[PDB]
């Protein structure tokens, strides 16, 4: 009778949450922005082509210097590129061939990666003789590492296929915090600009906003009909966007605690693999399994442009901190810099 009552109370609470959200829905973002002028056609060309990876590229991440970037490939390697010159700053052979994600520390001193090895490997870029060596191996997850993001040089946040996220102290290698609540594999995480909150998308078709210091799930967003493969904060930290296998992107607002927009088109049926905002947040860039990247008007939901320069799935993308360019990494083993 107690388990039954707890189930019925959970149902009543879900209904109450939905009714509150509907009580907040007095207008739409599309109505609010109906008066602002359209962006027009966003036309971008490839300025650089990063050639080197021998198989599918799975992930990339810009450095805070808006010049160096790190990428992880099916060839069992990380590559740190100088995007200005296309020169390979570093070529890191990994101890496991099953890499899936990588991250560039804000200081540029460390990189991180991992995958089906269930480990987050932290690589130091500046050693004694100037070599790249594994500085730490964070082990604790019981599933594959899907994403990781540095808070600083000593803390890192990871997401795993064991339906959990985690906050690690890099020095001691301990899981300082575990973020539990998802019911499916967590696919992507995104840090807020102040790094006190972060959002995570999962295969349970739900996104979750967590408090880093408190270690709790503050909010849960639904609406997608399939796996959430990517997630990205709006540059002011009050909203985020999700890309899903249901062929739609979605903008959710934190303070309104509900969905603001769907970015979709009847001619787009394949899934989204990556999402990112332009510097001002007006443009939403999304990578697709049909080999293209679509640039959306984030305020008016119209498709503003297409980056079509890959022969296979656009598996990742990312805008620089200065907003000067956008990098796209694909299953065709190439990265391309656009603007």
């Amino acid at each position: 009778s107690e388990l039954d009552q707890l189930r019925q109370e959970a149902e009543q609470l879900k209904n109450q949450i939905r009714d509150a959200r509907k009580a907040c829905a007095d207008a739409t973002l599309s109505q609010i922005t109906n008066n602002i002028d359209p962006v027009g056609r966003i036309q971008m060309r490839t300025r650089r082509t990063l050639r080197g990876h021998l198989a599918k590229i799975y992930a990339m991440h810009w450095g805070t210097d808006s010049r160096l970037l790190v990428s992880a490939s099916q060839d069992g390697k990380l590559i740190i590129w100088d995007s200005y010159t296309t020169n390979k700053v570093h070529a890191i052979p990994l101890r496991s061939s099953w890499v899936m994600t990588c991250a560039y520390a804000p200081s540029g001193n460390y990189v991180a990666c991992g995958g089906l090895d269930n480990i987050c490997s932290i690589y130091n870029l500046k050693t004694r003789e100037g070599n790249v060596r594994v500085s730490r191996e964070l082990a604790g997850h019981t599933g594959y590492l899907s994403c990781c993001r540095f808070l600083d040089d000593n803390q890192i946040v990871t997401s795993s296929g064991d339906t959990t996220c985690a906050l690690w102290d890099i020095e001691t290698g301990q899981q300082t915090t575990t973020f539990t609540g998802h019911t499916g594999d967590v696919m992507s995480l995104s840090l807020a600009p102040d790094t006190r909150l972060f959002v995570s998308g999962a295969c349970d078709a739900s996104a979750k906003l967590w408090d880093v210091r408190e270690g709790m799930c503050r909010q849960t967003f639904t609406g997608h009909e399939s796996d959430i493969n990517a997630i990205c904060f709006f540059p002011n930290g009050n909203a985020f966007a999700t890309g899903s296998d249901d062929a739609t992107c979605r903008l959710f607002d934190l303070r309104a605690d509900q969905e603001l927009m769907t970015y979709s088109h009847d001619n787009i049926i394949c899934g989204i693999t990556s999402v990112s905002f332009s510097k001002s947040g007006r443009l939403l860039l999304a990578g697709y399994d049909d080999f293209n990247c679509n640039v959306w008007d984030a305020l008016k939901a119209d498709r503003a442009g297409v980056l079509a320069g890959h022969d296979n799935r656009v598996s990742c993308l990312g805008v620089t901190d200065d907003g000067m360019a956008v990098a796209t990494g694909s299953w065709d083993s190439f990265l391309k810099i656009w603007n």
Binding site: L54, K56, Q74, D75, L116
Partner: protein
């Protein structure tokens, strides 16, 4: 022309190949000739903890081969005071109380049998398997073992691998030649049987059974049986590579020298008895014992040959009448009557009578009526002449007993009974085994026609495709024989050459500046891939198989090309220009063809590529980010 060892990288494949067959244990490697040589070299030269153990083992093994009791009296005291007493004084003696007690009790009692140190053998073995054996596996000695084992497992003999010389034997179905194996220089005989004759007389099963029996007997290094080292075949011939016996058979020597005295026949009898003991210990009955099947070597010592009519009785006894009329036992002629080794003892009696008298005891007036010899053999006992001595009389009496209940050698102790006959009072059978008795007939050097069949009185047929199938599993290599051949010929010199070459390549590699280390690499090694098929484009590249990919590189570049396990649909073996190669079917209709340097490399690469692609595909299916989604 000569044996070329593969590069040490071969270990990566070989170590896994052998590991799939449970062959990287202590028992399997230590009991092999080259394995023992390399392990002992490791312990003596490249390890200190194991050197005294191996030296003890070798001192015991040399003590076992001491002939006289006084030599053993001296050597046992030396071994005790050098390997047991001093190790006990240093407390570093790693052996049980029982072994020391046994050896010291036999020494104080002045009893010194050849097996005095057997408990020490067992305990040395138990002390060598383990950490010492694992450190041996870690060493480059085990790499050299992998090289030699790859060479062994890649043997494919043809006629061009032998320099063939004069004929040393003619039969109705083929000929035997003196030959030399080119890679080692070892002298052999080559028995070539003609498949067309075999078809004409329907004797395919006989040849296959001869090969099987030769395989059964050719271990243990029996000095009195013509043992086999290799068997192969060409479209027209079957070839056995056998012990060289160029002194002729005893039928010819009987027709030439005449009848032999008792003392001369005693030598042949003893050697044939030891050979029969070796066969019967392996559950084999020769059934064709006669002077024509007893061959002489260059010195006069004899061996039993032509095992075509032998059969294994470890499971089923025979009843058929097989043999040469005049040497077949009464229970053999009786079809439907089971028998085992007893036929060979009766045939021995018949053959010894023939050596003493010139004819079988049951062919009495040169009657060629086979039925007359049958009739005499089955009913009437043999009249042993007045010239015979009583000791020989008892020997033949017991051997020629028509009933198996009374026949010498069949009464529960086997050949040992025949050894204890008063006819062999004077013989030390250890000296017989060591071939220390002077042969009564020394063949003349290089003479001719010493081993022809009595029948030399020819057609030919086409060879069907099914007949070649009948000989599919005829090729065979006796591992112990090949390792003994290599050990006594080219093992040391080839090891020195290969050592030196690998040292020079180490100099070059440490002046030019490993990719497989520190990762999850499954396997690595040299393979040839095909480019343009019309240009005969074969490119030798070093391949690295990882759980999700197969990269390859050339000499002088990092790997710039790979093939993912995801895009591999099927791995299959396929013939390309009469060569076994691998065909990979790639997603998108493409094909990728690979060629290995040896059969073990091919088999292992196929196994591992199949396992890797299947496992990687099943794993990728379960990962939403990695798997293929509908488009």
């Amino acid at each position: 022309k000569k044996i070329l060892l593969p590069e040490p990288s071969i270990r990566s494949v070989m170590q896994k190949y052998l590991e799939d067959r449970g062959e990287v244990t202590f028992e399997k490697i230590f009991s092999q000739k080259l394995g023992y040589l390399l392990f002992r070299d490791f312990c003596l030269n490249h390890l200190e903890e194991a050197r005294p153990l191996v030296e003890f083992y070798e001192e015991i093994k040399k003590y076992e081969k001491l002939e006289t009791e006084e030599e053993r009296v001296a050597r046992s005291r030396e071994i005790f005071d050098s390997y047991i007493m001093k190790e006990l004084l240093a407390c570093s003696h790693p052996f049980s109380k029982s072994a020391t007690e046994h050896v010291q009790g036999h020494l104080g009692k002045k009893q010194v049998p050849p097996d005095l140190f057997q408990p020490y053998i067992e305990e040395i073995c138990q002390n060598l398997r383990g950490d010492v054996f694992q450190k041996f596996i870690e060493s480059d000695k085990f790499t050299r073992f992998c090289q030699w084992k790859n060479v062994e497992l890649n043997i494919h003999l043809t006629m061009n691998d032998f320099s063939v010389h004069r004929i040393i034997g003619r039969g109705g179905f083929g000929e035997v030649y003196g030959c030399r194996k080119a890679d080692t220089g070892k002298m052999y005989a080559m028995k070539c049987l003609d498949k067309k004759r075999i078809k004409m007389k329907q004797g395919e099963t006989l040849a296959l059974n001869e090969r099987i029996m030769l395989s059964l007997v050719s271990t243990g290094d029996c000095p009195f049986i013509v043992c086999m080292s290799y068997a192969f075949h060409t479209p027209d011939k079957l070839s056995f590579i056998l012990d060289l016996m160029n002194g002729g058979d005893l039928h010819y020597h009987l027709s030439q020298h005449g009848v032999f005295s008792e003392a001369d026949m005693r030598f042949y009898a003893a050697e044939i008895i030891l050979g029969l003991e070796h066969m019967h210990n392996r559950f084999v009955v020769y059934r064709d014992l006669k002077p024509a099947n007893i061959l002489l070597d260059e010195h006069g010592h004899v061996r039993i040959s032509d095992l075509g009519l032998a059969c294994d009785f470890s499971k089923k006894k025979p009843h058929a009448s097989v043999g040469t009329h005049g040497y077949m036992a009464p229970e053999v002629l009786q079809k439907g009557v089971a028998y085992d080794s007893s036929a060979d003892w009766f045939s021995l009696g018949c053959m010894l009578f023939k050596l003493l008298r010139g004819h079988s005891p049951f062919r009495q007036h040169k009657t060629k009526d086979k039925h007359e010899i049958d009739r005499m053999t089955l009913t009437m006992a043999v009249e042993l002449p007045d010239s015979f001595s009583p000791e020989l009389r008892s020997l033949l009496e017991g051997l020629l007993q028509r009933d198996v209940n009374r026949r010498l050698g069949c009464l529960g102790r086997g050949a040992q009974e025949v050894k204890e006959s008063p006819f062999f009072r004077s013989l030390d059978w250890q000296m017989v085994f060591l071939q220390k008795y002077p042969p009564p007939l020394i063949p003349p050097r290089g003479e001719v026609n010493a081993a022809d069949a009595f029948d030399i009185g020819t057609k030919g047929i086409k060879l069907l495709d099914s007949d070649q199938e009948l000989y599919r599993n005829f090729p065979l290599t006796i591992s112990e024989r090949w390792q003994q051949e290599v050990a006594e010929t080219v093992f040391d010199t080839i090891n020195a050459e290969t050592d030196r070459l690998e040292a020079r390549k180490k100099a070059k590699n440490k002046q030019l500046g490993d990719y497989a280390l520190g990762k999850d690499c499954i396997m690595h090694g040299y393979m040839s891939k095909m480019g343009n098929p019309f240009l005969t484009q074969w490119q030798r590249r070093y391949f690295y198989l990882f759980p999700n990919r197969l990269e390859w590189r050339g000499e002088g570049e990092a790997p710039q090309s790979l093939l993912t396990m995801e895009e591999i649909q099927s791995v299959e073996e396929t013939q390309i220009k009469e060569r076994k190669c691998l065909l990979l079917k790639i997603r998108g209709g493409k094909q990728f063809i690979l060629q290995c340097d040896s059969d073990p490399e091919l088999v292992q690469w196929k196994k591992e590529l199949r396992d890797a692609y299947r496992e990687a595909q099943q794993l990728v299916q379960r990962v939403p980010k990695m798997k293929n989604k509908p488009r």
